[PDB]
Amino acid sequence: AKILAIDTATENCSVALLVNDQVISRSEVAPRDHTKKVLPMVDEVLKEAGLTLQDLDALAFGRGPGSFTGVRIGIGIAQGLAFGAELPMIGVSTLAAMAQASYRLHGATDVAVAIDARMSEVYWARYSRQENGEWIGVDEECVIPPARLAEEAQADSKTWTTAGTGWSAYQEELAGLPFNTADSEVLYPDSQDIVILAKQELEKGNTVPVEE
Amino acid sequence: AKILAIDTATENCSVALLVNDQVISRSEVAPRDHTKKVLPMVDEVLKEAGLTLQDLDALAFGRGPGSFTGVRIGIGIAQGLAFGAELPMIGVSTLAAMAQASYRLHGATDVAVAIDARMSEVYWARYSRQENGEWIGVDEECVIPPARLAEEAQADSKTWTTAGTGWSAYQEELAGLPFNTADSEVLYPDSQDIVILAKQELEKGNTVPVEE
């Protein structure tokens, strides 16, 4: 179960490595650039483990949504390094990714992810931890102006723990629909969790090739 | 002398491979995306040569200028692939790159590269082929509004073959200074030429590590 993940999707540049239920995580809440940090971290991660790229049996990545430039860049490195160790690959949703963090720290089964898209819109989904440890998609991945989100889907009555930067960027507007809600201390996805999501795609045989 | 170059700087996505004075080139005048074409080409290149990444003794890349997203993306793959074959690397100027093409087709020793920056400015340099085959930098790499370029530097009296997309996007304005000039059929850099530039950085011992 040897997986190495990269994420470059939001403000947080992160790289982590699962080697048999032992996730050594690296993170950096990043700037205008990304390249300059992503390799050295992958190097750090691996030396602190004695693995090589061809040791790993999968290479995982934030597939987005998230920043256009950024989310491309990391996929670009994630291909680069896969190609050379002949690795299969695993794309992983930034949204569901943040749902896992919300379990990891808060033990929440009910997660509402809202990522601040640019120009007045929001990347949104909701997920729901099912018995297996998986996440039933309670709402499809969308991009919506939060206003419209509020008047669509009356949906349920449940305590959704809110994650990602949509929340703090459009309160006025996400303030408008009875779902129960809870603050989260979570802003961005992290490769910590991304791995643990990827670790179950393997066990479902759900990996692409290398040129996805 | 085994070098593989990637370029993703302008509208032209290109990958080529020098294996002993034999450059098998791949090119594609590309769209809104880049990832999807860059790997397969690097794969194509290598099968039609029986080399692997760890066969090569350097991996080169367009360092830019050029499109922000683009130029990051290629650099991102060119690190990814370097890292896994433990390769040294070689960044290469898109401008001087296009100077080489202008030799390759037209045999020009006097090149004026102007790339259409966005928002009313231009990426510009001038190079001059010295006896060795190197290129004296007749003007430092810049980013100027073409207007200002015209009234700066009276400079010389010589026949500069113009390349890159500045020329056709600001004629009125680049039309204003006596240098002699000649049309070129050249618009973007190509990994064809990038390699032959890289092949000489090696011979000067001028390669960075892998996390440049």
Residue numbers in the entry:
A (entry chain D), B (entry chain A): 2 to 213
Paper passage:
The yeaZ gene product forms part of the conserved network YjeE/YeaZ/YgjD essential for survival of many eubacteria. and V. parahaemolyticus (C. Thomas, personal communication, 19 November 2010) demonstrated that among other as yet unidentified roles, YeaZ functions as a resuscitation promoting factor required for cells to be able to survive in, and exit from, a VBNC state. The structure of VpYeaZ confirmed that it is a member of the ASKHA superfamily of actin-like nucleotide-binding proteins characterized by two domains (I and II) that hold a nucleotide-binding site in the interdomain cleft. EcYeaZ has been shown to interact with the conserved essential proteins YjeE and YgjD, with YgjD being the preferred interaction partner.
In this paper, we report the crystal structure of V. parahaemolyticus YeaZ (VpYeaZ) to 3.1 Å resolution. The structure of VpYeaZ has been solved to 3.1 Å resolution revealing a two domain architecture with a duplicated βββαβαβα secondary structure. The asymmetric unit contains four subunits, each comprising residues 2–213. The 19 C-terminal residues are missing, most likely having been proteolytically removed during crystallization. Remarkably, YeaZ appears to be unique amongst other members of ASKHA superfamily in that it lacks these inserts; the lengths of loops β3α1, β4α2, α2β5 and β3′α1′ in VpYeaZ do not exceed five residues. Analysis of the packing of VpYeaZ monomers in the crystal lattice identified an obvious dimer with 2-fold symmetry and approximate dimensions of 30×45×80 Å. The dimer interface is formed by residues from helices α1 and α2 from both subunits, which form a 4-helical bundle. The dimer interface in this form shields 9–10% of the monomer surface area and buries a region of strongly conserved hydrophobic residues L40, L47, I74, I78, L82 (VpYeaZ numbering).
